[PDB]
């Protein structure tokens, strides 16, 4: 709690505002009411005479739709000194620091004498006050010339939390007076007397525009804009009563900005509703109470870190929107009611407002989501999560905020289509004041209704709506809008749900005698969509069933067939940027493969069924040592290969999967090395001469195996299945593992680092592996789309020659800790979402510095407990006490099964390591540069290749696509098992051994699957390579030089690379075709 | 066009 | 294109190197200079660094030859020492983990020859084709780079024959048990020293090198402070 604490200390003073400029601003607008004191008063007025007032003047008046006309305009207009007060952060001088720069609110009350009783109907206040606005723009303005600060002040109107009823005047300054520095704009809120209109008039569920349907929105306008004063006193008291008022209170606001939340308006569309004031009240009201007991749940006491926890926390659990509400006094203990409005409501009894009325329901799920998922963190203690919760901005990139984007582009974008502004409707003027805050309600509600349970989260966010106006005009002008609606297009973000995503049928209600009311508006709904099924159960349903396609989910036709039939059939709905990340997902050659879904595993399961029927066999033939257990450890078996098995397709390197055999123990396996590997091998040999007679069906062959250095005798048996799925047994010895501790311990001194690493590979392939994949597979079950997203991750690496040095095992790991370590984003729940969520993290890992340690663990045991953690974090301090630079060590990733850290990432050249993070970084700054699109995921996936040193151009003999299963092919085995290798690819064995051979001279790459990265052919491979720095100049010559040179002077050499080409292009062989360096 | 990136070989790009 | 002999000593051997489509005079060169040991299975051999990939025996045999006909000299190569093209050979696990069965720099090696006739004639010829690549480059030999063993190297996806396999396991095993049983019955056959100390051999025990390496591997709790005059006398000064 104390690190907490203390950091949090460290933010405040980072963020705090200089007080310097605060005399700046403060000599400013205390001059500015002087000017406001000079302004005159003016006499009645009708619309006719203000409009001859106004007409020849460059200020224009800001009337609020509808604008009144000479008919229903009889009431008269008139302006008055207003009384000028102070309000917002500022007042409560809780402001920080905002280099975007922050806003002072100065209000201005109309005099109540301006007012009838009734002037809260039809708009009768607002153009009233629309008016005193306009006169003290020309005033202020001529007078602003007169004080000759005109020439660094700029003027224009503006929307009060983006409130299209609420225009307000903001003051900024340009480039003694001049406050441009300070980075602050004053905004000149006009609001009304307290208790000028009855408030009980003014309830949600009442009515003040005449046409009866209830107005929320215009009644809160008018009673907030009636009650700013009040809760500046309610604040102003708190603040006195708990000493962390002000502190509380910037914690929310810097935790706010970093979701994205504002305090402006949200039913037209902008993530928002819940800011300051609404961070402010809420915690106020809970310091007076807040339970169903009305008991404090905050007390004046708490802290800071205390007063932001049970804010976070209520927030999480309690429900203000569907079932359950709030009520307290500003001027009478708060208390929780359990029934709720069905919207997000804080009501304030002192004052009749609700003060959620800005906050959408689909926003308040996801800011229920967010808190909940926060308070999580807060509750952790193995994990520091300071910077998660705070300086972490998740509202840079939508697509990685959201699973899902689709834009919608309405048709006749000067004004829109008469059909659609037709359906507007003068019940939902009423309702909703403007056509943007019905079209947002429109398209939420059907595609809520239409998708239900496929997602948990969707916002509409109205791309390129503006909410400031210069003063010559009256509303604000769109490119598109023609001052008809103002927004370019409508952008559709979902969080969808993995679990139900994909499901085929839309389930309905049930059928009866008589169509019941939801089954009504479920068959009007889809229309001919709708259908009555039955199924197995014999239950029948109203359902509609969709089809499954490779390309996209369902979320996409879903979405398109609903909006167009009920919003409008000429809109066009498109997200090409999941179909191309689709797309390039290599598609197996099965039957049906175009329309599987990418979160299908059928294949995997059908490869596990043969290894069942094989898993049988091997039990039932006798040996001289009971089998104890096959482990299968191949990368199918956790559904991580790159690409889906298909039937005899033996071209894919991944064909055959590893398995491990172990028989029971026994005290007569030879206690010498290669003696124990050649018992094994015999345990092999009998196991295959049964399997051949017992089961001629299958066929098998003997391998030589080489991963681990220096054992050069492991032998492996591949048994060829005949459904067409290969097996590699390997055998595993109790004695093995000690035997290598044995080499270690009498190595020589100098030698036992090279022994260690030939241990570390040996735990690394029989050990380690069986825990890797067995924690893999279950943990894949919850997290739906792990598969695909690390297939993609290793295809990425694979096209820019990566995944040569990349151990298997590194990349999912790597994958893997958007999901097991969310925050302070969700789980990622699309395909584009994981991927580019792995992107973001390699940009900002610095691996030499922060470690990398995950909970392979299911959501929320066999989590990381303090002392695991902390034995963790001393591993990674100790190792780069050794290694500060990180040469020999770059990513340290430990986890339950890896607790040394070092196991899956040692080995790996420090230029892989940099480039793997130097591509991560430079694709995150395309990403901000230009948003996705099909050119910029296009240039994702390509390999630029120029940096390389010297580039070789291979092609094999045969394309090997078809071979590989990958549909843009081979039925049977061949006869002959020799003739497997002419349709093999061995350019990765080429690089692998020319990598020892020029190890301490170069670094060699190669694409490992030509089927999916070598063209339409899949046959064409690329061989890469880079010199290092000490052999790329001249050096002395000496015998430990250990490269290929060339004499220059009697003392002097330098590298050969002409000569090293020839060695690499005869060793090709016909496959090299063309150098280039 | 392509994501080329200069190689590093100091870490410094970390 | 003048260096001919490298000021410590290795002299530069120009090869000409082969002829192939994707490298459309690119030239390897090797160093080399006498070598000199007592060791017999090292004496009359020739020190060589920057091979080409993949030199086999049959490879300077060639060569070899080739330095014999131009020039009339006798040489004959015996054998290629110490060629670990792949670093694969450095270490042998076997004599590291146990002593039965195995009693037991980089990028260079030994070309051992017959007779110390045939180095004192290989190593003037030697000196001579080096002088060539200075005057006339174009009788520079080619190094072939293609041999018996390099197709074998070449075919790494090839199934090892069962039938072989079988053979060489049952013999290497074979082997195997004899030395173990020699080795269990050494241990445990009542050892006596010269002087006539008889070594103590557990039950189970097989190797004699082992008993050695576990030897090589590997009174204050009865000690009372309150026995003597002296002890409770000291007991009585630090109390007071």
């Not at chain 1, 004063?229 to 935790?255: D, P």
């Not at chain 3, 090696?109 to 007779?115: H, S, T």
Request: charged share 20%; with cysteine; glycine share 4%.
């Amino acid at each position: 709690s104390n690190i907490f604490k203390l950091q949090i200390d460290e933010l405040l003073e980072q963020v705090k505002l200089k007080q310097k400029h605060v005399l700046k601003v403060e000599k400013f607008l205390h001059k500015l009411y002087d000017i406001l004191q000079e302004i005159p008063d003016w006499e009645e007025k009708s619309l006719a005479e203000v409009d001859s007032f106004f007409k020849n003047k460059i200020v224009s008046v800001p009337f609020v739709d509808p604008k009144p006309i000479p008919q229903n305009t009889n009431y008269k207009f008139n302006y008055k000194k207003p009384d000028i007060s102070l309000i917002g952060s500022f007042a409560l001088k809780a402001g920080i620091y905002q280099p975007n720069g922050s806003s002072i609110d100065t209000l201005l009350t109309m005099p109540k004498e301006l007012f009838e009783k009734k002037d809260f109907l039809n708009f009768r206040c607002l153009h009233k006050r629309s008016v005193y606005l306009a006169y003290l723009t020309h005033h202020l303005l001529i007078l602003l010339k007169k004080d000759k600060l005109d020439s660094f002040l700029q003027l224009e109107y503006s929307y009060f939390d983006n409130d299209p009823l609420l225009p307000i005047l903001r003051i900024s300054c340009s480039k003694d007076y001049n406050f441009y520095k300070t980075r602050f704009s004053i905004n000149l809120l006009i609001g009304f007397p307290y208790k000028v209109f009855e408030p009980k008039k003014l309830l949600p569920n009442r009515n003040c525009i005449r046409i009866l349907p209830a107005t929320p929105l215009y009644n809160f306008s008018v009673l907030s804009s009636s009650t700013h004063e009040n809760y500046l006193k309610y604040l102003y008291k708190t603040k006195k009563q708990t000493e962390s008022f002000v502190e509380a209170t910037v914690l929310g606001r810097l935790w706010l900005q970093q979701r994205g939340f504002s305090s402006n308006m949200s039913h037209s569309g902008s993530l928002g509703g819940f800011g300051t004031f609404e961070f402010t009240i809420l915690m106020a009201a809970l310091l007076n109470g807040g339970g169903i007991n009305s008991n404090k749940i905050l007390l004046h006491g708490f802290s800071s870190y205390q007063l932001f926890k049970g804010v976070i926390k209520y927030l999480a659990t309690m429900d203000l929107c569907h079932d359950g509400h709030l009520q307290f006094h500003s001027n009478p203990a708060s208390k929780y009611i359990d029934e709720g409005f069905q919207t997000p409501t804080l009501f304030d009894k002192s004052t009749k407002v609700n003060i959620l009325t800005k906050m959408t329901v689909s926003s308040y799920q996801i800011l229920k989501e967010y808190a909940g998922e926060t308070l999580r963190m807060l509750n952790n203690v193995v994990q520091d999560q300071f910077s998660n919760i705070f300086l972490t901005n998740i509202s840079r990139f939508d697509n990685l905020k959201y699973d899902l984007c689709y834009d919608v582009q309405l048709p006749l974008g000067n004004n829109l289509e008469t059909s659609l502004a037709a359906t507007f409707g003068s019940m939902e003027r009423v309702k909703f004041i403007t056509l943007e805050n019905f079209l947002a309600h429109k398209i939420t509600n059907v595609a809520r209704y239409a998708l239900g349970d496929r997602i948990k989260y969707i916002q509409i966010e109205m791309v390129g709506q503006k909410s400031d106006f210069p003063i010559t005009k009256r509303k604000v002008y769109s490119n598109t809008g023609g001052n008809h609606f103002n927004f370019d297009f409508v952008r559709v973000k979902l969080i969808v749900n993995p679990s139900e995503c994909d499901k085929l049928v839309t389930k309905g209600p049930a059928h009866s005698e008589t169509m019941s009311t939801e089954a009504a508006v479920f068959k009007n709904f889809w229309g001919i969509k709708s259908s009555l099924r039955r199924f197995k159960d014999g239950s029948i349903t109203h359902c509609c069933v969709w089809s499954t396609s490779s390309s996209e989910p369902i979320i996409s036709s879903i979405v398109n067939f609903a909006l167009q039939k009920h919003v409008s059939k000429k809109a066009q709905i498109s997200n090409e940027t999941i179909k191309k990340f689709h797309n390039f997902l290599p598609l197996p050659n099965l039957p049906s493969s175009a329309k599987t879904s990418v979160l299908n595993l059928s294949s995997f399961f059908n490869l596990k069924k043969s290894f069942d029927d094989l898993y049988k066999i091997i039990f039932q033939m006798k040996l001289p040592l009971s089998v104890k257990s096959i482990l299968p450890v191949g990368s199918a078996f956790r559904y991580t290969s790159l690409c889906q098995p298909v039937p005899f397709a033996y071209s894919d390197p991944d064909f055959f999967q590893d398995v491990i055999l172990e028989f029971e123990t026994s005290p007569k396996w030879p206690d010498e090395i290669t003696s124990l590997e050649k018992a094994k091998t015999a345990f092999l040999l009998k196991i295959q001469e049964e399997l051949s007679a017992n089961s001629s069906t299958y066929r098998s062959f003997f391998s030589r195996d080489e991963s681990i250095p220096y054992n050069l005798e492991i032998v492996t048996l591949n048994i060829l299945t005949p459904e067409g799925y290969g097996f590699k047994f390997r055998v595993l010895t109790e004695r093995d593992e000690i035997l290598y501790l044995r080499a270690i311990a009498n190595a020589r001194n100098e030698l036992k680092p090279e022994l260690e690493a030939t241990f570390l590979k040996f735990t690394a392939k029989y050990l380690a592996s069986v825990r890797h994949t067995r924690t893999l597979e279950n943990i894949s079950h919850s997290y739906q789309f792990y598969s695909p997203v690390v297939r993609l991750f290793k295809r990425w690496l694979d096209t820019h020659l990566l995944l040569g040095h990349i151990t298997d095992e590194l990349a999912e790991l790597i994958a893997i800790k958007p999901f097991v370590d969310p925050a302070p984003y969700f789980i990622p729940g699309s395909l584009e979402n994981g991927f580019l969520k792995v992107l973001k993290f390699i940009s900002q890992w610095n691996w030499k510095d922060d470690p990398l340690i995950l909970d392979l663990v299911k959501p929320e045991s066999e989590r990381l407990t303090l002392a695991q953690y902390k034995g963790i974090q001393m591993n990674f301090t100790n190792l780069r006490n050794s290694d500060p630079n990180g040469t020999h060590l770059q990513f340290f990733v430990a986890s339950k099964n890896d607790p040394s850290g070092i196991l899956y990432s040692s080995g790996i050249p420090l230029p892989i390591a940099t480039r793997l993070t130097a591509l991560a970084k430079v694709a995150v700054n395309l990403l901000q540069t230009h948003g996705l699109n099909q050119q910029t995921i296009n240039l994702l996936f390509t390999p630029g290749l120029k940096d390389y040193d010297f580039v070789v151009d291979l092609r094999t003999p045969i394309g090997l696509k078809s071979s590989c299963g990958i549909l843009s092919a081979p039925s049977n085995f061949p006869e002959n098992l020799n003739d497997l290798s002419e349709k093999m690819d061995p350019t990765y064995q080429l690089v692998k051994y020319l990598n020892l051979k020029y190890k301490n001279s170069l670094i060699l790459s190669s694409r490992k699957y030509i089927g999916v990265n070598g063209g339409e052919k899949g046959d064409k491979n690329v061989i890469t390579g880079l010199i290092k720095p000490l052999f790329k100049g001249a050096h002395k010559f000496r015998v430990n030089l250990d490269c290929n040179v060339k004499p220059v002077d009697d003392e002097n050499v330098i590298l050969n690379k002409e000569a090293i080409f020839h060695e690499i292009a005869a060793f090709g062989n016909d496959m090299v075709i063309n150098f280039e360096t | 066009l392509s994501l080329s990136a200069g190689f590093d070989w100091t870490a410094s790009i970390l | 294109e003048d260096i001919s002999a490298m000021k410590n000593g290795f002299i530069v051997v120009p090869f000409k190197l082969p002829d192939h489509k994707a490298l459309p005079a690119s030239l390897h060169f090797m160093f080399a200079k006498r070598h000199q040991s007592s060791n017999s299975n090292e004496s009359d051999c020739l020190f060589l660094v920057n091979l080409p990939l993949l030199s086999n025996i049959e490879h300077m045999k060639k060569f070899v030859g080739q330095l014999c006909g131009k020039y009339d000299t006798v040489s004959h190569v015996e054998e290629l020492l110490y060629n670990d093209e792949f670093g694969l050979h450095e270490v042998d696990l076997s004599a590291l983990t146990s002593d039965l069965m195995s009693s037991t720099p980089r990028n260079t090696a030994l070309l051992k020859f017959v007779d110390a006739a045939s180095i004192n004639n290989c190593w003037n010829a030697l000196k001579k084709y080096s002088n060539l690549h200075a005057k006339h480059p174009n009788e520079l030999f080619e190094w072939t780079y293609t041999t018996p063993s390099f197709t074998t190297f070449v075919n790494f996806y090839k199934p090892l024959d069962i039938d072989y396999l079988k053979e060489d396991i049952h013999t290497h095993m074979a082997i195997f048990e004899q030395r173990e049983a020699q080795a269990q019955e050494d241990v445990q056959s009542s050892i006596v020293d010269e002087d006539g100390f008889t070594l103590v051999v557990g039950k189970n025990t097989k190797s004699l090198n082992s008993i050695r390496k576990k030897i090589l591997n590997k009174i204050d709790k009865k000690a009372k402070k309150d026995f003597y005059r002296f002890q409770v006398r000291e007991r009585k000064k630090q109390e007071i």
